[PDB]
Each structure stands twice: as structure tokens, then as C-alpha cells.
């Protein structure tokens, strides 16, 4: 069949990036054949798909002995468009890359027999968060809310800073976020991403892309990538996890409103005890509303629109892992 | 093509001198003809309000012609998007008003959004200071641009409450 | 390299006179007799390789007896695996053995007055940092810095000395030139008259230059022959790579001990004498190091412009490299720069690929079809490269290539199997497919030939894990990524008990049953184990963690690098009590929380480390003065990506690694 030249492209392309990137120095990947990951995935059509995207979609799987979380690639709406192709493999090889943290969405190897790879990863146990919270058929405490919290931070300061180049992926959706047994935020897809050279900080980004609502109205406005893309993008991301609102809502009346149109004004107005998610008020929430409160002032502080005020993650991941002081 | 649009004429490369109060006429032109482009029907968004769009005939006529989700953002690729078009998706009037505001600033002073600090973030703050423009001589005293740079200001509020609207901008214009 | 041949030659011939299988005959006396002569020409050879210097006409012989001292070896590996009757070569020694001295007639005068190193084996780091000119006053301290630079490079005897301005006035004080000139005389040093030999040999080169860029130009072609020519053949093959790639030594080390440019006979044996040489080839400031580990092993390194270029030409005035004609040594295959597919010839030592950090040598079905049309092609590494065809069925011509010594195809993807080209072949002295994460099977007849030295499946994840029994093979002295097996599958760590030559291994441990109960105890009478590596990549179940602490390593130690274990205690065998000597240490990433008390167990062990490595673990909870009372040996201790540690001295153990040197 054509899944042996399928193979023989995919890898001859997935080895260039990989090498292109990290010098060939890669992490124990190992590959798989399409009598597991089918049955894997039960022929891509169940209750273990998790979710959607633009390129790719989340499952759930199970090979023997073990369950996994499965990515695949849309090859409907990647393979006549360059720029996705290029982009799709700088996605798995910087996931690759970039599994050598204990928050990332840990990479387990890759299914190449197919037209687009097809890639496994570790499995954690819940499922994705949605843009409210675990979608599997059941609500998740405060505690971890602040635990993802710090564990998207962190994350998204070792995109930015634990290179040579720095690389930006200019979306941090709570989407993306996953969430194993141990209630850790295993950040996944890095798959949005664009890798600026080496010392400048600021390039023109080629196109400008990615999920309306999280857009840095200074990149939306001026059109290129920098330093403090995520800052916003991250800042709305933290006020998802507090409001449980999402960022296209609507009250009655066509979604005129975005999380950050409404705490702002709603600051000087409501005093702040109405942006917590008030189906976590059976939640006690003793003292720690005022970590609520410092944590809504950071994001809004990150999220202003003079990107010279805005901290840097690093910054917010400091100080958002600092407010932990009420334990 | 008649001439080509404001950009290839205003920002053809700094040269080409624009001229005296028309562009004034122009813009209004230009909000006479979308008012019953999108606003005479039940209801039109005009989707792709930019200096790009709007050209030129040979007496400087500003008829407006040839104008889901989706990650990579087109929809106003620069300032002239709304603080709403950030956040909701939606393209409601507010969009089109707030993009005919910053156009409106632009023929007022020509001056694009670039960053070597945009429009708003120039325009607002410097207000009598209305020496804002420098490339003509005859721009400070017509004195009815300061009623329209106050228009432009009450266009570029942020808020989608206290909007002006295309049919009533005209107004304060003439 | 008329010298640097003829030691590599006698040494073959010292190491194959004792198998005595074959004493009926004729040409097995005239060995003694063959090297009796060259033990007298190597008293010369070395001056008579740089009289060849201005003067045309030892290019006309001594050339050609280089080039049959390659045919000589050559003739004696076909004696070596003959297995038959090979009687044809008795008079083909006799066509030169009667020919040689008809050289040496002009030979008679030209002196008209030992293959190791003493000096290569300590390293002296000696990169300590118009800038381009300096003073008389200035250079000489630094050149006293970089050239004795055994007692902080002093001046103790002052009769050295003014020798010791003379040399560093002649090249006006420029950096490279006296680096050169000074990594040179790290080595003898003994007395005054030797320093005015080589000070006449570098006065008289530039008696007719003229120009500063001639004027350093062969500043150092002096230093490149005033050196034992068994590390003067290894300076020349890095010539191969283009002008500023970054060099990893886990190509051309290889590359040196596969056709055999480093020799050993005195137990240390494969590695231990590859970065010997190596480090004492940078003792010579020839090549300058890029990057450290925290274990100050060496990785990358690169050379400098003015200086590739001359061992360009010495390849060009060599026969050697640059194929841009045919009679050149052995190839390298580069990026997209061999499209002229250099052609099918017997002279082809061997091949190496070379890249920049970031390229691949596409390369089409029909070279590696060209590499195995050769026979005596001892190294093939074809390391960052792609193909539109599996290196199965397209290297599966070897059997007709029997003397191969090296083969490193790391990072190349299609290499699904490697081929059952490979039971006859029987040298095969290193193998290692490292980083390629597509290995479907590794073959059982690797079982057979009993040599091997380094056996490198590291990182490479998709594997069954091993042959049988690898515990068969004895000369095994690096072995990364071992795996042992299931129950009644493939290996097991009960049998590599039966190694005991082993310095650095590897092991990649998933489930529980890898290991097992028995097998636990299969690590403490390895006698020479050196660096024990581990990588527990990954734990679905439990089992792994609850018995695996009692696996311990050979006491004697020096680098432990378990770099994922998925536990979140320590290993419990960590400890001061059970490694006494270890002296690196390194945790990548895991999820480890705390460690046991017995990890530092200070009543009256403490660690005797030099270095540490805690570097992407979002677990650990430790204190730095904790770490000085429990470690009191350090250097550094690089520690980059790891939160709720912020105890710790540098300034965001969480975020950016300062790795803390101890002033």
C-alpha cells in the first residue's frame, strides 16, 4: 500500500525539523503501527474523542495495557496550504523538543504510516479542559484552579525563555490545557507557534493568526508577534479559569462582551466579589478570596493595552506562584 | 481602475499633494454612499471597511465598491478594527463607525498606524491642541476640523453604547 | 602523513604477530623483516617530513612509499581474513621489500645524525578566554599561561626564557600564532637545545614570507609536524569539515578508532584512549573546545579558519581530502555538496558525513550503492541524512565489504531494519544507531563477532530491546541503551554480568518485568564500570519503582546519570554508602519528590562528587546549605528548571540555570 511512501515522506520531513531544530538530539519517541493506534482510537469515530481544533483533533486511545491521549491531523484542511505543512511539523517536533519539562503534555512517539502523523502522547486521566472546566460527564476545585494557574505559567515561560531563539505560541486557550490524575496542568499542541532568531525580541509576523477572544489587541492592531504576545493571551486565559466564562459569551443578546469588557468596569463598580465563578461559592473560599482578588488585579494588569506596563511571564509566573503564600 | 485608493494617493510613498478642504467632501462622499449601501437595506455590515477599499474617480469620487470561524484574523489587519472586534466576533455597526472614524483621522491628518503608539493612542491624548497635522498650511485654519476632529474623537469611544452612526455623521460634517 | 602511516602500520603488525596460525610458510618471517627496516626509517622520517618542505623532489618517492605503506597494511588485512589459501601475497611484500631502500639511497644523508604519547593524557583547558596585537610585554605572560601551563604556566628556570622571548617576537604577538606555538611546547620542555632546534625550524620558515598573513600562514605547519605522527594522522581527517560546523567527537573519535588511527595494546583500551588522544590534540591548541557538559566531558569542537585551511592544502600537498581529484584518502560526504558522485576506487579508506548544525545531506540510492562498491572502506557513518529508500535493502550489499570497523548511523530515519547483510562480517568495532527513533528489530547475528566497543542504542525508543545473549561478547567497554528483556524474551541483565570490560552504559527501563527478582544483583563485578546511565522513560504501572532499588552499581563510578525515574522518592541505592568514588551525578527530568535520608547519610560518608546536575524536575524540595554539609566536593552544580527549590543560590533555580561555580 502507500502508507510505506507515506512513512518514507513523513519521516524524511519530521527528521529535517527535528534536526533543524534540536540538532538530531531528540527524546526517546517510538513509533507505531496502524493495527494499534486504530484500535486505538476505535477508527477515529466514538466517545474517546475528546475534541476539536482547527488542525487536529484530540482522542483518547488504548494500546495494550494502556491508555493514551491521541492527536491526530486533519488532512482535509492542512494539505493544500504550505504554510500549515511547514507549520505542523515545527508543532511536533517543538512538542518533542519541548517534553523534557514536567508541564508540558508529555510526548510518548509518533504514528507516521499515515498521510499526516498521527501522534500519540502520555495519557493523562481527565480529559481536556474545556473553556470552562473537565469535560468529562460529571466541576474541579479552587485548589487546582490555582495549581493550573501556575502550571500554565511556567509552562509558557519555558516557551519564552529556555532557548537559544526564543518562540512564542501566540494561544494560550484554556482549551488547550489538560489535566491528569495528580491534578497537574499538562499544557499540550504547541502548535501555533512561529520561532523568532536569536537576541531581537520583536519580529512582523507573516500572517496573523489565532482564536478570536485571545488575540493581544496589539498584535491583532500592529500585526507582529512579540515578546509580550501571551501576555494578554495568557492574562484572559487566567480570567477563564476564574469567571468560568467564556471569552465569546453572550448575556440575552448577541456576545457583545469579552471577560476583560466586564471586570475593568466592573472593578470600581462591583467591588470584585462577583467575578468567581459563583457555582464555587458552595465552595468556603475563607481567606482566600483575596488571593482570588490579587490574582484578577495581575490579570487585568496583564492585560492592559501599553504592553510596556505588562509584566513578563516570567513576572506573572513569580508572582502568581508567590500568592500561594495563603497555604 | 479609476485612480487607485487614499493610500495611493495620501501614502503614495510621501509625495502627491492632496488639496484643500475636499477630503472632507471625500470622506463624506464616501459615508453618503455606504449610508444607503448597508444602512437602506434591513440590515448590512459593510465586513471590510479600510483605506483600501475606498478609490478615487477623477473628480475624487469615495464610491465604496467590491466590499464561520477563522483563526488567521484578516478583518481589519491594522487599527482600523474596533476594541470589540478584539473580543466578541461579531461585525456589528459599531465596527464599520469606529473604521470610518480612523479613516476620518487619517484624512484629517495623514498619518497611518505603524509602530517604528497608534492612532488612539496619539489622537486622544493631544487635544487646544489641534496643531496636530504639519504637511499642509491651509489644514489649521478652516476651523470646521476642529468640529470634525471632535467628531472623530466622540467616533473612536470605545464603548458600543454612545456610538454615533453613518446616517448622523454626516451631519456634523456639513 | 609519510610518518603518520608507518607507526599505524607497525602497530597492526605488533598486534598480529601473536596469533602464530599460520607459521608454514614464507610471509609470515618477513614481518620482523619488514618492520625491522621501518623501525629504522621512523628515527628520520619525522625531519624528513619537514625537509620535505621547500624541496620537490621527496614528493616524488617518499609519497609513493606513504601510499604503499597503505597498501602494505592493506595486504595484511587480506592476510588477517584470508581463512584460506592466500599464498598469492608472498611476492607481492617481495615487490617492495627488495624496493623501499632504492628510496633510502637518497635517503643517506638527509638526517646525517614510539607511536604514543607521553603528553596527551593531561588536559589543560587552555582557553582562558587591536585585541589581535599585544606587546612583547603582554604576550608573553599569556604565552607563558598557555605554554608550560603545568605549574600555572611560571617561569622557573630562567635559561628557558630568552628562548622564550624569541620565538614570540618573530610572529609580532599575534593570538592564534602563539597559542600554536605554545600548545607545541606544553610537551618536552626538558632543556635549552631542543628549543633552539625548534627555534631555528620556526626562524628559518619565516626567512622568506613577508606578509602576515604568510607570516602565520605556516606559523604552525612546523607544530604540525613537530608531534607523534599517530595524533599528526588524526589533526588531518578534520580537515573533511567545512569552515565553521561545530564538530561532535562522537563522529570523529569514532571515525579515528575505526580505521585505526589510535592505538592500545596496555588493557585501556577503546575509549579512554580515543579522548586521549584527543585531549592531547587540544593540549596543542589545534582544536579549541565549544561546550562542556556538567561533567566537563567535552562534546563539540571547532578549529579556526587560517588554520583548516592549511590542513586543506597539507590534504592537497597529501593526497587526502578536497576529491576534486581521485587520488585522495577517504570522502566527506556533505550537504548537497557531492552531487558529482565522487566514483568508485579502490584507495577510499573510508567515508564520513559532516554537516553545520542544522542541515541534512539529502543523498540518493545510488552512493550507498557507491559505498559498498568499495572493499576497504573502514568507516561508514552517514549520521544526519534522509532517503527515499530503507537502509535495509539498500545496505545490504556489506557482505561483500568484510573489513569494516565503524558504522554510526545515528539520526537517519529510514532505518526500520538493520540488514541481514551482517553475519559474515567479523571485525565491526563499533557500531551505534544513536538517537534513531525507528528500529523495529536489532539483529541477533551481532552475537557472533566478539569485538565490538561501543554499542549505543541510546534514546531510541521503539525497539525489542535486545538480542539473546549479550553477555557472550567480553570486549564491550561502552554499551548505551541495553533494555533488558521480558521472561522468555530476548536479553536480560543476568547475563551482562558476563561483561566486565564496560565503562559507560545505558538503560531504558518501561515496565516492571525488564527487570526482574534475581536479576536484580546483576551489577557489582563489573570491574572497570565507569559511568552507569539510566533513562526509566516510562511507568504505566507501579511495578518498576517498587523493585528496582536494590539494582546496584559497581562501587567504582564516575559519572551516574539517571535522567527520567518515574519515583518519587530516591532509588535508594544513591548514596555515599553504596558509590563511594562516583564523581558526577545527574537528575533530568522526573518526579521525584524527596529523597530518602539514606540519599545523603552523612554519620561519616559524604560524597566525594565533583559535579551535579538537577536540571527540568517540577518536584524537588532540597536546601543549598543542606547540599554543602551533605556534598562537600563541588565544582559546579547546574541546576536550571526546577520550582519549589528556591532555597537554593542561583538567581531562579526554577527558570534559568546558573550553574554555581565554586570560587
Known amino acids: 500500500?502507500?502508507?510505506?511512501?507515506?512513512?518514507?515522506?513523513?519521516?524524511?520531513?519530521?527528521?529535517?525539523?527535528?534536526?533543524?531544530?534540536?540538532?538530531?538530539?531528540?527524546?526517546?519517541?517510538?513509533?507505531?503501527?496502524?493495527?494499534?493506534?486504530?484500535?486505538?482510537?476505535?477508527?477515529?469515530?466514538?466517545?474517546?474523542?475528546?475534541?476539536?481544533?482547527?488542525?487536529?483533533?484530540?482522542?483518547?486511545?488504548?494500546?495494550?495495557?494502556?491508555?493514551?491521549?491521541?492527536?491526530?491531523?486533519?488532512?482535509?484542511?492542512?494539505?493544500?496550504?504550505?504554510?500549515?505543512?511547514?507549520?505542523?511539523?515545527?508543532?511536533?517536533?517543538?512538542?518533542?523538543?519541548?517534553?523534557?519539562?514536567?508541564?508540558?503534555?508529555?510526548?510518548?512517539?509518533?504514528?507516521?504510516e499515515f498521510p499526516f502523523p498521527v501522534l500519540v502522547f502520555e495519557f493523562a486521566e481527565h480529559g481536556a479542559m474545556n473553556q470552562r472546566g473537565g469535560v468529562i460527564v460529571n466541576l474541579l476545585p479552587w485548589s487546582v484552579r490555582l495549581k493550573i494557574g501556575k502550571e500554565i505559567a511556567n509552562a509558557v515561560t519555558y516557551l519564552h525563555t529556555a532557548f537559544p531563539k526564543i518562540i512564542i505560541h501566540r494561544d494560550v486557550k484554556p482549551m488547550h490545557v489538560f489535566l491528569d490524575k495528580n491534578w497537574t496542568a499538562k499544557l499540550s499542541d504547541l502548535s501555533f507557534s512561529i520561532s523568532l532568531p536569536e537576541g531581537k525580541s520583536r519580529i512582523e509576523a507573516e500572517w496573523v493568526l489565532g482564536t478570536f477572544g485571545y488575540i493581544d489587541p496589539l498584535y491583532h492592531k500592529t500585526c507582529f508577534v512579540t515578546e509580550y504576545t501571551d501576555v494578554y493571551s495568557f492574562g484572559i486565559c487566567l480570567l477563564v479559569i476564574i469567571t468560568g466564562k467564556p471569552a465569546i459569551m453572550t448575556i440575552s443578546d448577541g456576545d457583545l462582551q469579552g471577560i476583560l469588557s466586564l471586570v475593568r468596569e466592573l472593578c470600581e463598580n462591583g467591588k470584585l466579589d462577583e467575578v468567581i465563578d459563583p457555582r464555587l461559592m458552595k465552595d468556603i473560599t475563607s481567606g482566600q478570596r483575596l488571593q482570588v482578588e490579587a490574582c484578577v488585579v495581575l490579570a487585568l494588569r496583564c492585560c492592559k493595552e501599553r504592553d510596556e506596563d505588562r509584566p513578563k511571564m516570567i513576572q506573572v509566573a513569580k508572582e502568581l506562584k508567590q500568592i500561594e503564600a495563603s497555604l | 481602475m479609476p485612480k487607485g485608493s487614499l493610500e495611493n494617493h495620501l501614502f503614495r510613498r510621501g509625495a502627491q499633494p492632496l488639496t484643500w478642504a475636499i477630503r472632507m467632501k471625500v470622506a463624506v462622499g464616501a459615508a453618503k454612499g455606504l449610508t444607503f449601501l448597508h444602512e437602506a437595506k434591513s440590515q448590512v455590515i459593510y465586513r471590510d471597511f479600510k483605506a483600501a477599499n475606498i478609490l478615487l474617480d477623477a473628480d475624487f469620487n469615495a464610491k465604496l465598491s467590491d466590499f464561520t470561524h477563522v483563526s488567521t484574523k484578516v478583518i481589519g489587519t491594522h487599527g482600523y478594527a474596533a476594541p470589540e472586534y478584539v473580543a466578541t466576533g461579531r461585525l456589528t455597526a459599531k465596527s464599520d463607525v469606529y473604521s470610518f472614524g480612523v479613516v476620518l483621522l487619517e484624512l484629517i491628518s495623514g498619518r497611518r498606524a505603524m509602530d517604528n503608539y497608534s492612532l488612539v493612542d496619539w489622537a486622544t491624548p493631544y487635544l487646544l491642541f489641534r496643531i496636530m497635522d504639519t504637511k499642509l498650511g491651509g489644514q489649521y485654519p478652516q476651523k470646521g476640523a476642529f468640529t470634525a476632529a471632535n467628531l472623530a474623537l466622540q467616533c473612536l469611544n470605545p464603548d458600543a453604547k454612545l456610538r454615533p452612526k453613518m446616517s448622523e455623521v454626516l451631519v456634523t460634517l456639513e | 602523513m609519510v610518518d603518520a602511516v608507518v607507526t599505524v602500520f607497525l602497530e597492526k603488525t605488533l598486534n598480529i604477530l601473536e596469533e602464530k596460525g599460520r607459521t608454514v610458510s614464507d610471509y609470515?618471517?618477513?614481518?620482523?623483516?619488514?618492520?625491522?627496516?621501518?623501525?629504522?626509517?621512523?628515527?628520520?622520517?619525522?625531519?624528513?617530513?619537514?625537509?620535505?618542505?621547500?624541496?620537490?623532489?621527496?614528493?616524488?618517492?617518499?609519497?609513493?612509499?606513504?601510499?604503499?605503506?597503505?597498501?602494505?597494511?592493506?595486504?595484511?588485512?587480506?592476510?588477517?581474513?584470508?581463512?584460506?589459501?592466500?599464498?598469492?601475497?608472498?611476492?607481492?611484500?617481495?615487490?617492495?621489500?627488495?624496493?623501499?631502500?632504492?628510496?633510502?639511497?637518497?635517503?643517506?644523508?638527509?638526517?646525517?645524525?614510539?607511536?604514543?604519547?607521553?603528553?596527551?593524557?593531561?588536559?589543560?583547558?587552555?582557553?582562558?578566554?587591536?585585541?589581535?596585537?599585544?606587546?612583547?610585554?603582554?604576550?608573553?605572560?599569556?604565552?607563558?599561561?598557555?605554554?608550560?601551563?603545568?605549574?600555572?604556566?611560571?617561569?622557573?628556570?630562567?635559561?628557558?626564557?630568552?628562548?622564550?622571548?624569541?620565538?614570540?617576537?618573530?610572529?609580532?604577538?599575534?593570538?592564534?600564532?602563539?597559542?600554536?606555538?605554545?600548545?607545541?611546547?606544553?610537551?618536552?620542555?626538558?632543556?635549552?637545545?631542543?628549543?633552539?632546534?625548534?627555534?631555528?625550524?620556526?626562524?628559518?620558515?619565516?626567512?622568506?614570507?613577508?606578509?602576515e598573513t604568510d607570516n602565520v600562514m605556516s606559523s604552525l605547519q612546523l607544530s604540525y609536524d613537530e608531534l607523534p605522527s599517530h595524533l599528526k594522522s588524526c589533526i588531518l581527517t578534520l580537515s573533511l569539515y567545512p569552515e565553521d560546523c561545530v564538530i561532535p567527537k562522537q563522529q570523529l573519535v569514532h571515525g579515528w578508532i575505526g580505521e585505526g588511527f589510535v592505538m592500545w595494546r596496555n588493557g585501556r583500551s577503546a575509549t579512554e584512549s580515543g579522548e586521549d588522544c584527543f585531549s592531547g590534540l587540544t593540549n596543542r591548541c589545534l582544536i579549541e573546545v565549544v561546550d562542556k557538559t556538567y561533567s566537563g566531558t567535552i562534546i563539540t569542537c571547532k578549529i579556526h579558519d587560517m588554520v583548516r585551511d592549511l590542513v586543506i592544502d597539507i590534504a592537497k600537498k597529501d593526497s587526502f581530502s578536497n576529491p576534486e581529484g581521485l587520488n585522495c584518502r577517504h570522502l566527506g560526504i556533505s550537504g548537497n555538496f557531492d552531487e558529482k558522485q565522487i566514483k568508485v576506487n579502490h584507495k577510499l579508506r573510508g567515508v564520513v558525513s559532516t554537516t553545520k548544525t542544522g542541515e541534512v545531506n539529502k543523498l540518493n540510492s545510488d552512493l550507498a550503492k557507491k559505498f559498498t562498491d568499495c572493499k576497504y572502506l573502514r568507516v561508514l557513518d552517514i549520521s544526519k541524512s534522509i532517503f527515499d529508500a530503507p537502509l535495509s535493502e539498500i545496505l545490504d550489499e556489506i557482505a561483500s565489504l568484510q573489513h569494516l570497523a565503524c558504522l554510526s548511523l545515528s539520526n537517519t530515519h529510514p532505518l526500520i531494519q538493520f540488514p541481514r547483510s551482517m553475519e559474515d562480517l567479523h571485525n565491526l568495532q563499533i557500531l551505534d544507531a544513536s538517537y534513531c527513533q525507528n528500529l523495529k528489530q536489532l539483529q541477533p547475528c551481532?552475537?557472533?563477532?566478539?569485538?565490538?566497543?561501543?554499542?549505543?542504542?541510546?534514546?531510541?525508543?521503539?525497539?525489542?530491546?535486545?538480542?539473546?545473549?549479550?553477555?557472550?561478547?567480553?570486549?564491550?567497554?561502552?554499551?548505551?541503551?541495553?533494555?533488558?528483556?521480558?521472561?522468555?524474551?530476548?536479553?536480560?541483565?543476568?547475563?551482562?554480568?558476563?561483561?566486565?570490560?564496560?565503562?559507560?552504559?545505558?538503560?531504558?527501563?518501561?515496565?516492571?518485568?525488564?527487570?526482574?527478582?534475581?536479576?536484580?544483583?546483576?551489577?557489582?563485578?563489573?570491574?572497570?564500570?565507569?559511568?552507569?546511565?539510566?533513562?526509566?522513560?516510562?511507568?504505566?504501572?507501579?511495578?518498576?519503582?517498587?523493585?528496582?532499588?536494590?539494582?546496584?552499581?559497581?562501587?567504582?563510578?564516575?559519572?551516574?546519570?539517571?535522567?527520567?525515574?518515574?519515583?518519587?522518592?530516591?532509588?535508594?541505592?544513591?548514596?555515599?554508602?553504596?558509590?563511594?568514588?562516583?564523581?558526577?551525578?545527574?537528575?533530568?527530568?522526573?518526579?521525584?519528590?524527596?529523597?530518602?535520608?539514606?540519599?545523603?547519610?552523612?554519620?561519616?560518608?559524604?560524597?566525594?562528587?565533583?559535579?551535579?546536575?538537577?536540571?527540568?524536575?517540577?518536584?524537588?524540595?532540597?536546601?543549598?546549605?543542606?547540599?554543602?554539609?551533605?556534598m562537600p566536593y563541588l565544582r559546579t552544580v547546574t541546576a536550571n528548571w526546577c520550582p519549589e527549590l528556591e532555597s537554593f543560590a542561583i538567581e531562579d533555580v526554577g527558570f534559568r540555570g546558573g550553574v554555581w561555580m565554586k570560587t
Request: some cysteine; aromatic content about 8%.
Open chain 1, 1 to 112: 500500500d502507500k502508507a510505506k511512501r507515506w512513512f518514507l515522506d513523513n519521516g524524511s520531513i519530521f527528521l529535517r525539523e527535528l534536526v533543524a531544530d534540536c540538532n538530531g538530539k531528540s527524546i526517546p519517541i517510538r513509533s507505531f503501527s496502524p493495527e494499534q493506534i486504530l484500535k486505538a482510537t476505535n477508527n477515529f469515530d466514538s466517545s474517546c474523542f475528546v475534541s476539536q481544533d482547527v488542525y487536529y483533533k484530540w482522542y483518547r486511545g488504548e494500546i495494550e495495557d494502556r491508555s493514551y491521549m491521541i492527536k491526530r491531523f486533519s488532512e482535509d484542511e492542512i494539505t493544500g496550504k504550505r504554510h500549515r505543512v511547514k507549520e505542523v511539523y515545527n508543532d511536533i517536533v517543538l512538542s518533542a523538543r519541548m517534553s523534557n519539562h514536567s508541564n508540558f503534555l508529555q510526548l510518548l512517539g509518533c504514528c507516521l
Open chain 3, 446 to 630: 551481532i552475537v557472533l563477532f566478539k569485538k565490538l566497543l561501543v554499542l549505543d542504542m541510546t534514546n531510541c525508543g521503539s525497539l525489542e530491546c535486545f538480542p539473546k545473549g549479550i553477555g557472550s561478547l567480553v570486549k564491550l567497554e561502552v554499551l548505551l541503551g541495553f533494555k533488558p528483556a521480558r521472561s522468555n524474551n530476548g536479553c536480560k541483565l543476568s547475563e551482562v554480568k558476563n561483561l566486565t570490560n564496560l565503562r559507560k552504559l545505558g538503560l531504558s527501563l518501561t515496565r516492571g518485568d525488564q527487570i526482574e527478582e534475581e536479576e536484580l544483583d546483576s551489577l557489582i563485578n563489573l570491574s572497570k564500570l565507569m559511568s552507569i546511565s539510566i533513562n526509566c522513560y516510562d511507568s504505566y504501572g507501579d511495578d518498576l519503582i517498587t523493585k528496582i532499588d536494590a539494582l546496584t552499581p559497581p562501587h567504582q563510578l564516575h559519572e551516574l546519570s539517571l535522567q527520567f525515574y518515574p519515583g518519587k522518592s530516591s532509588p535508594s541505592w544513591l548514596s555515599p554508602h553504596k558509590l563511594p568514588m562516583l564523581r558526577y551525578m545527574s537528575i533530568c527530568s522526573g518526579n521525584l519528590v524527596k529523597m530518602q535520608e539514606p540519599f545523603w547519610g552523612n554519620e561519616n560518608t559524604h560524597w566525594r562528587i565533583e559535579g551535579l546536575m538537577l536540571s527540568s524536575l517540577s518536584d524537588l524540595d532540597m536546601d543549598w546549605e543542606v547540599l554543602q554539609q551533605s
Open chain 3, 28 to 211: 609470515r618471517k618477513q614481518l620482523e623483516d619488514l618492520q625491522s627496516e621501518l623501525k629504522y626509517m621512523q628515527s628520520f622520517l619525522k625531519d624528513a617530513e619537514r625537509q620535505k618542505r621547500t624541496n620537490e623532489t621527496l614528493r616524488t618517492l617518499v609519497a609513493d612509499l606513504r601510499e604503499l605503506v597503505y597498501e602494505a597494511e592493506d595486504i595484511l588485512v587480506d592476510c588477517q581474513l584470508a581463512d584460506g589459501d592466500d599464498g598469492n601475497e608472498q611476492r607481492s611484500s617481495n615487490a617492495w621489500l627488495s624496493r623501499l631502500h632504492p628510496a633510502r639511497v637518497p635517503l643517506q644523508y638527509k638526517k646525517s645524525k614510539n607511536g604514543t604519547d607521553r603528553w596527551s593524557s593531561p588536559v589543560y583547558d587552555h582557553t582562558q578566554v587591536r585585541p589581535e596585537l599585544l606587546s612583547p610585554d603582554n604576550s608573553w605572560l599569556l604565552f607563558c599561561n598557555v605554554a608550560f601551563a603545568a605549574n600555572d604556566g611560571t617561569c622557573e628556570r630562567p635559561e628557558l626564557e630568552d628562548v622564550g622571548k624569541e620565538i614570540v617576537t618573530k610572529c609580532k604577538g599575534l593570538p592564534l600564532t602563539i597559542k600554536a606555538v605554545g600548545g607545541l611546547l606544553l610537551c618536552k620542555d626538558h632543556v635549552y637545545h631542543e628549543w633552539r632546534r625548534i627555534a631555528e625550524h620556526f626562524q628559518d620558515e619565516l626567512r622568506g614570507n613577508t606578509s
